[PDB]
DNA sequence: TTTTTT
């Protein structure tokens, strides 16, 4: 047969070009998988791999028309599709893949077996990926300044390290984290360090993903989150001001699912794979429209309690309760960070933290006791018990306290209930929470019959 | 071998075509990097560089089809991308790049190593970039008329020199500048001089960005801010009249970050690079919806106090208190400025000021003292200290001062608090400000117990 | 209004 078909067959035999389910062709060039929806990178591969072919086939690949013919043959012979990005414990670079389990770096065919379509965007360097380096001690000093290693801050520092370490994993995560602190506290420095550590796997979007409907019309903000591993949203408005849009809880529930529904402009694709940890940098406590048990299990908070002040205003910052330590700031730090001085030391520290927590299994846990707005419900869980058959026999005491056995179940009137809950809740500050909770569980037998099926745990105890 | 392939390889070896992360190709023609989507700049480059090749190669480049073949080979050879605009201390021109560190001018290949996409839009002239010039004395007279060299105007003068100089640097800035002055004081003269000095690096933008959300829908104003170095906001509406929109503080926070989130029309792009200094010219005191420590750290102000009046109204202007000096009004000055008469003389002054200030490090500092609104918040922080363990052991004396014990913490009743803070603030003007401060830190002990968690320094320090 | 569409 003709030599062009033989060249196409030999190229296909190396498995350097593949077709995905989304309809795009990926090519293995320069030790990386690359694709482009508007430029057919196939011809680049044809020109690049001309050296591996024998001598009599190299000369005919210098003409663009024969390259077009070979690309047409390859497109004809390529029929079926394959799946991509199935290994959550591999970190891809521009010249290889790093294994997070043991720490070796793989290049060439060894890295080809893990079909990763995303990368940091820069080459990995072994010389700078060391522990004993002049930059490392300085980075450790900076980090110990931001998060001191004290017995009081141990628990917060653990969440800090775990949340930062989770950015290397390519799996769905069921919790999003808030970075809370005052001004000049080090939150943006941490953001820029993470950006300079992970490169193109990092992205930041607007706040419209938390207050607006996601699936109405085109929405590039949701679409750009596909296959990313870290998403930052920062500088939320103060909700105390009038006209502020409160955070939608259903958006929070949707953002923790493995697939997110959204559509970019001029597109028909509506599914996006969610691999990104979500970090919200803020200065004020969040406010939600509706609070329920489903929302409280997807929220975590990390505190920042160190101030970096000019010498002129130091004496003022020492009189504030929002700070636990005041230190002079360095003016040249931001320029050093912008030049990627601490890229590989921070990456090495992130991998070292990855071994500590996520090797058995990757999991994030909520911290519902850090939000004041969640206080009302939490202690409600420790004060009331739903009515049951076991409470019927002891009615002798409950009728003494004012309970009524109505339809063979122990019951308490709303009017009888409200003062009883008023003795343990400050009616002035929790005025709205009490009327909120009473109305979603009222039970009315008749126009004049009112009752609620709950029993206090203190009354159930034997006196 | 293929002759056209050899021509393409030799062309590529000169590093005249580059591929960016944006998917665009940039070429080096006429001592400048140019790029655009629908133009065949590559073929222009092949035709232009024809003379650098041996004579057996120059003849073939006269046929358009062979040029298309060479372009195809070149496009197939370019696989990797490169960074652009990484030097903040360079001033790109149409025919070269000027280094601000030493002052001498590069051209040719020397200017190629700085991949600067933007340019001033005009041609540099060596002869006109001279100090001893008869235009220089006129420019110096105008500048000294706007900002006199008096002792009481020393510090302000320095600020006036710094901000303009910051227009040369290509880095990010974290402060906002207000050009506050009454009518006919020289603000637009400085704006026009700066525009004539820098060319297309200048941009003028309306007040929509200050008062409206930037992440909702498309926003063309953010799109063209990319890689600009000077942004002016002119004709700020008066806020005393009803219906005026208050300035958003979150917009101020978002305008000082290295990356600004915004989307141009008909596009999916969401990221931009912020390299511009923003100057707002107004005739009235600005007002902000919310005032916090974060906002008063990103604001600077410089004053204009010299008035230009026609001789008819001099009697009206010489007695006004808002002015300091009155001068003759020159009608022909407007004629000279838009003729680009002082294009290079002002540039020399800008470079001199850049050597005076920004050689060690580029930094802009805020001036929160000169704002009528911020003084209320500034003063309170210097008379109140939050209670802690240190102020506990003085338990006895503070009881005689009206302070009340609660939860083993010193507290001050609100009723005891209003008279004492009214000793420094009269309620007729700062009543709303006082109440706005109160609501933030208001804490409740009982249904009728009103108190604050602060202690006065004057009430604890011995007289 | 703007993606839409050309
Ligand atoms: N370890 C450190 N030592 C000295 N200075 C530091 C250190 N870490 C950070 N800084 C500096 O302190 C300042 C803190 O600014 P940064 O933007 O990080 O704070 P922030 O709390 O995130 O601010 P904001 O929320 O208001 O944007 C910066 O100038 C930063 O360079
Ligand atoms: N040094 C000067 N000597 C004389 N006239 C001046 C001088 N500087 C500015 N002017 C006059 O001021 C006018 C422009 O003022 P402008 O910058 O618009 O003030 P404002 O910005 O306060 O409105 C010009 O018509 C010019 O004639
Ligand atoms: Mg910050």
TrEMBL record, chains A, B:
* Keywords from the UniProt entry: ATP-binding, Helicase, Hydrolase, Nucleotide-binding
**Under the GO molecular function aspect, what terms does this record hold?**
ATP binding; helicase activity; hydrolase activity
Asked if S-adenosyl-L-methionine is a keyword of the record, the answer is no
Every SF3 helicase domain range: 155-317
Q: Which domain of life is it from?
A: Viruses
> What does the subunit section of this Swiss-Prot or TrEMBL entry state?
Homomultimer; hexamer. Interacts with OPG148.
Record function comment: Multifunctional protein required for genome uncoating and replication. Major viral uncoating protein that is required for the release of the viral genome from incoming viral cores containing the viral DNA genome. Possesses an ATPase activity that is required for hexamerization and uncoating.
Family named by the database record:
Belongs to the orthopoxvirus OPG117 family.
Q: What is this protein called?
A: Uncoating factor OPG117
Q: State the species of origin.
A: Monkeypox virus (MPXV)
Q: Give the shown range, full length included.
A: 323 to 785 of 785
């Amino acid at each position: 047969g003709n030599k062009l078909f033989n060249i196409a067959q030999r190229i296909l035999d190396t498995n350097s070009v593949l077709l995905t389910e989304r309809g795009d062709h990926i090519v293995w060039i320069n030790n990386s998988w690359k694709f482009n929806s508007e430029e057919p990178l196939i011809t680049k591969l044809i020109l690049s791999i001309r050296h591996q072919l024998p001598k009599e086939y190299s000369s005919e690949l210098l003409c663009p028309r024969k390259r077009k013919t070979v690309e047409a043959n390859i497109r004809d012979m390529l029929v079926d599709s394959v799946e991509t990005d199935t290994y959550p414990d591999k970190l891809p670079f521009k010249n290889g893949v790093l294994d997070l389990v043991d720490g070796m770096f793989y290049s060439g065919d060894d890295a080809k077996k893990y079909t990763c379509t995303v990368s940091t965007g820069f080459k990995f360097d072994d010389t700078k990926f060391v522990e004993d380096s002049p930059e490392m001690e300085e980075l450790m000093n900076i980090i110990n300044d931001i998060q001191p290693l004290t017995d009081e801050n141990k628990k917060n520092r653990e969440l800090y390290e775990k949340t930062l370490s989770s950015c290397l994993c390519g799996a769905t995560k069921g919790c999003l984290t808030f970075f809370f602190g005052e001004t000049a506290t080090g939150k943006s420095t941490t953001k820029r360090l993470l950006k300079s550590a992970i490169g193109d796997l990092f992205v930041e979007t607007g706040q419209t993903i938390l207050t607006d409907v996601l699936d109405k019309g085109p929405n590039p903000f949701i679409a750009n989150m596909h296959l990313k591993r870290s998403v930052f949203c920062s500088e939320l408005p103060d909700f105390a001001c009038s006209g502020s849009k409160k955070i939608r809880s259903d958006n929070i529930k949707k953002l923790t699912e493995p697939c997110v529904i959204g559509r970019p402009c001029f597109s028909n694709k509506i599914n996006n794979r969610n691999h990104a940890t979500i970090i919200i940098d803020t200065n004020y406590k969040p406010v939600f429209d509706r609070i329920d048990n489903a929302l409280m299990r997807r929220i975590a908070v990390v505190r920042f309690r160190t101030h970096f002040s000019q010498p002129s205003g130091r004496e003022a910052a020492e009189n504030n309760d929002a700070y636990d330590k005041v230190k002079l700031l360095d003016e040249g730090l931001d320029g050093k960070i912008q030049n990627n001085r601490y890229r590989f030391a921070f990456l090495y520290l992130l991998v070292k933290w990855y071994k500590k927590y996520h090797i058995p299994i990757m999991k994030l846990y909520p911290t519902p006791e850090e939000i004041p707005d969640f206080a009302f419900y939490l202690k409600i869980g420790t004060l009331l018990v739903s009515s049951s058959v076991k409470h019927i026999p002891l009615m002798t005491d409950l009728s003494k306290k004012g309970y009524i056995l109505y339809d063979n179940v122990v019951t308490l009137p709303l009017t009888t209930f409200q003062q009883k809950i008023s003795k343990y809740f400050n009616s002035r500050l929790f005025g709205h929470d009490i009327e909120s909770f009473i109305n979603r569980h009222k039970k009315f037998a008749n126009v004049s019959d009112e009752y609620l099926q709950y029993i206090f745990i203190e009354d159930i105890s034997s006196p």
